[PDB]
Design a protein around this ligand. Structure first.
Ligand SMILES: [Zn+2]
Lengths: 59, 138
């Protein structure tokens, strides 16, 4: 969709559902977290919430 | 125990998306999936077992099969943790003025650009921050 400037969470909305922070279209790369509890990658990155995430974001 | 799946180039994000879906629908023990722009042709898939991934990719379009061996979460960490210059910092241009030292004068946290006053010879140069490395810090 678009990607939140703060947390990188992917959404279509102009404000992020997780925290109401502005989202941009200029985002790159993708991390899909299916299970936060059991993902070592999500641990490292520091994602509590399951969902799609960009890897880089800019305005 | 992170695996690596050989896909068609430029279809990594597409396929990741469907991998996520099939894995939730079919209840396979797939925990995260990673597609980096730098890692074209490959979608990294984190999973309990190789079988999960073989079941995941079974009949997947544009997927050419799984690479042997695992990759460790040590090796992926660069891709999962990607600046911080200040006006007055001296930098070297690393990408037309390669090798040139310069003082920073305006830092654009928005366009993610940086405006530079070269040491050599006459006009301000603006560059993406990507294209410059810090040398001195003030
Ligand atoms: Zn956010």
């Amino acid at each position: 969709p678009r990607a939140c400037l703060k947390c990188k969470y992917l959404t279509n909305d102009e404000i992020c559902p997780i925290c109401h922070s502005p989202t941009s279209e200029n985002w790159i790369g993708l991390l899909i977290v299916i299970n936060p509890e059991k993902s070592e990658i999500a641990k490292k990155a520091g994602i509590d919430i399951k969902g799609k995430y960009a890897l880089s974001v800019k305005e | 125990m992170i695996f690596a799946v050989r896909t068609m180039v430029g279809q990594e994000k597409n396929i990741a998306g469907l991998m996520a879906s099939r894995a939730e629908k079919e209840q396979l023990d797939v925990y995260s999936i990673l597609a980096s722009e730098s890692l074209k042709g490959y979608v990294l898939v984190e999973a309990e077992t190789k079988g999960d991934v073989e079941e995941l990719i079974k009949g997947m379009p544009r997927v050419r099969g799984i690479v042997p061996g695992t990759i460790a979460i040590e090796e992926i960490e660069p891709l999962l943790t990607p600046e911080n210059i200040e006006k007055g910092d001296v930098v070297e241009i690393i990408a037309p003025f390669k090798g040139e030292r310069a003082k920073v004068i305006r830092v654009d946290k928005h366009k993610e650009e940086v405006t530079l006053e070269l040491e050599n010879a006459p006009i301000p140069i603006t560059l993406p921050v990507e294209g410059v490395k810090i040398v001195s810090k003030h």
